[PDB]
Write a protein that binds this DNA or RNA. Sequence first.
RNA 1: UCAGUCAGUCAGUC
RNA 2: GACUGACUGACUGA
Lengths: 662, 180
Amino acid sequence: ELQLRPYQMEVAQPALEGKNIIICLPTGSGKTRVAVYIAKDHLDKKKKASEPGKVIVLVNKVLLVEQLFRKEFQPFLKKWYRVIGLSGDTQLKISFPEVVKSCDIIISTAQILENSLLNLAGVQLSDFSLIIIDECHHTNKEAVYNNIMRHYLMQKLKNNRLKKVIPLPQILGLTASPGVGGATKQAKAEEHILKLCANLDAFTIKTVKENLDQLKNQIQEPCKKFAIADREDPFKEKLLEIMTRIQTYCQMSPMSDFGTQPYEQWAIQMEKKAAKEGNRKERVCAEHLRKYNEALQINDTIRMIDAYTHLETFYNEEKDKKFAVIEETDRFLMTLFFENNKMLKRLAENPEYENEKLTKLRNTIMEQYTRTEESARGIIFTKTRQSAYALSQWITENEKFAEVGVKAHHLIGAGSSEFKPMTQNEQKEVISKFRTGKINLLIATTVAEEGLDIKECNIVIRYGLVTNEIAMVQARGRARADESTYVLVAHSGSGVIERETVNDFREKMMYKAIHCVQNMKPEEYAHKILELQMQSIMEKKMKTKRNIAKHYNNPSLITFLCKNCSVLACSGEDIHVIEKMHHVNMTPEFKELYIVREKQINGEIICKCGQAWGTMMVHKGLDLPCLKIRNFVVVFKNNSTKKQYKKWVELPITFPNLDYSE
Amino acid sequence: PLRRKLWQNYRNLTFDPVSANRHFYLSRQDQQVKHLRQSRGPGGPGSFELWQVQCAQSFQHHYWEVRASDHSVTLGVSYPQLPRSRLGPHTDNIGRGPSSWGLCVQEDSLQAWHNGEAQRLPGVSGRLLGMDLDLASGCLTFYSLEPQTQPLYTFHALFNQPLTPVFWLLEGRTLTLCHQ
RNA sequence: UCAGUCAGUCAGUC
RNA sequence: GACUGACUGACUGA
Ligand SMILES: Nc1ncnc2c1ncn2[C@@H]1O[C@H](COP(=O)(O)OP(=O)(O)O)[C@@H](O)[C@H]1O
Ligand code: ALF
Ligand SMILES: [Mg+2]
Ligand SMILES: [Zn+2]
């Protein structure tokens, strides 16, 4: 029953016949169903006159592929048309062009199309007719969407040349907060909204200005509330003791206090320069103090035991690696660390000591669930995966929560050498368990902030998060329920509340700026858009020429050296690549240099130092170990300096492939 | 003046250690109650599984005052046949059946429960509360004392058993009595 | 213009 | 279930 409410028809009226536009209603306004109706009329009208017609929907998070394929298009067009839902996990049994010729509504993640389009038989952007772009504000400086729209713009300028045609597909785009590109003045916000409209090749913004009362009724402004706090505990300063002594061992310069980002960055660069020098007795110390600072920062974010586990999990594996070479400065660390960590482990287990933030979060969750009485779903937004899993554990362990009826689980994205990785089907089952109601307090990261559809979520909580204004306009949105509450938690130490205020002010700026661009004179709009279109293409040409300059390569010039020691490992010629992807070596003496270590399918390589070089990987019946450049140092033969590269594409060198003939 | 006229029907009250719940704590000559995170031993028989505590006194009119540390707390009265076990997820039992009558205070609004039903009542800033009951007329009335006196609500009923006061507390919350 | 943590997207070898 | 490779965006820092 596609009986649209009035204001949806108001916003969709211009788009219903030509005139590619944009559309923005606040969250909870059923924009997806506007897309459904527009697609239906597009296909019906094209069929009536018997001309070829297709429609493609671009989405930008995989979860949403299944959501929009199961909830909304499928029932409303199950009968008239053929709809297929494709993504990045499904193991296609058929190539993409056969799929496009096979169906006529394609729900896909945009990166798939972009792969299939730069592959030159492929597919040309003119095959399609309607291009719906969901959450299209991500069209910005060289994003995944913008490559597609740039092919569209090149064709448009080619048609402006041709006029002195190949029809271009009609475009539609859906947003909730087009956002301002970091602007403090009205003129710059005006400029940014114009640039967005330019890259989409729109005609207007077309926001509802007639049926205001009805819209203000459907959407509910949720209640904002502030849970803020800022208990004596040795642990932070107890470890400050050890780390201060460790610094004093080498007398390094702080330049700032502990527990904050500049210290971590400082440790990184000092480590890098020392490694370039070769100054051992300092590298290990700097990296260990970095680890200790990370421990403090995790102690800030999450419960204490997780910090202690991070520490012990680093160190025990360190000693496991070190005692394998058995079969001066180094001992100085463990001989201290082990006494102190036994002390810690007995200290951290004592639960009357606590973090500060967690107590306020504990008060919020349980109080608010107690008042709800079994009509309550909640989403807690955080920053790091590890934070998600740790919060799930902390909800499960202490038993008072489970009596008030909170049932919890963590939702994170697929694809990090820690607790346990969630995988695609587990995630789908998690949201499936969450929609009905036997998982009740979902703890999530950035993945579920633009797109979830849960009809009932009373409670949205934000945990010590700092972010731009669109990732705050949407996160309030996800609380798509009546009597909603958006509760913010932070301790004033880091700039969270000031960020909240600037974000709210930027929200006001953004709305008013859309109201500004809504009312220009059409001549000015058309000409400004034309100029803006030209600008992006010219700047892309400039960046491309700089890029082809930057790529510029004797593979035999350089030599790789160990990074904790400086014992020469091998030269460039010994390196090969498997399928332009895996850098590997086949050499026999280079095989006698390293030591495997299993604690296993794939074995980790170790130098004499204990530092890791790479892993064993088996290819086409050869047994063969690889190398990672992050673990080495490059020594040239022109200028005898010492350089480190983070990832292999940085190095200007091109390597040949693994002749396999031997 | 109204509270002064009430105070000649004031009655002193004290808790019962048996009815106290596990994580709770009794203090000040058994006249103040606090609730902590760490368990105070196993519960054992005679203790309400849901988060309530009852006073030792009961009434075969009467009036008294209760001070509350913060919001999200409940005060009420039941017949002696109040169930002590738990069969539902939510952890409050007053007002779910006809056998009791309760009033729950929160930051937003008030809710007065009986027989499994309640109505929203506009919220109050104050924490101190007063409560009166007359068995002869069979009526139970609540009062907010600060800044002024307000007859918040009245319950009409016929009683065939004495009433015992019962209190429901969250974590980190405290509740004190008054004496004269 | 460069570095740094963080999240998300795709593609290979077992 | 395990191992890699590369585009991308927000945050902080010169
Ligand atoms: N015609 C309609 N009648 C009633 N509810 C509708 C209608 N159209 C959409 N909705 C509601 O809108 C919700 C979908 O909104 P959606 O467009 O996904 O929000 P967002 O724009 O944030 O993605 C659905 O849960 C549905 O209940
Ligand atoms: F289109 Al939305 F939240 F606004 F999915
Ligand atoms: Mg949407
Ligand atoms: Zn080494």
